[PDB]
């Protein structure tokens, strides 16, 4: 998704809500592959909820238009 919308600024993409949350989760998982003793280390992959939350918002508004569909996201945001 960086190479599609690589519109001059890279800091438009890297330091954002959707991206930083992913880099907090996925970068440790790549470190667990290279380092053999870091499988047992705690990785906050529970934060993927806030990414799945943001994944829903872009998906749902692809197509009232956003009365029932918006409120279903507002339940997801809380849960």
């Amino acid at each position: 998704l960086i190479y599609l919308s690589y519109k001059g600024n890279i800091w438009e993409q890297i330091f954002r809500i959707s991206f930083i949350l992913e880099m907090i989760n996925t970068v440790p998982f790549i470190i667990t592959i290279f380092w053999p003793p870091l499988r047992n280390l705690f990785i906050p992959v529970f934060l993927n909820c806030w990414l799945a939350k943001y994944a829903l918002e872009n998906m749902i508004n692809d197509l009232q238009s956003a009365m029932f569909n918006q409120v279903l996201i507002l339940i997801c945001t809380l849960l």
């Binding site: 998704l1 190479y3 599609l4 919308s5």
Partner: peptide, 10 residues
């Protein structure tokens, strides 16, 4: 850039 861009976003 050319191939994947027409299928991802557009």
């Amino acid at each position: 850039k050319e191939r994947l861009k027409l299928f991802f976003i557009k």
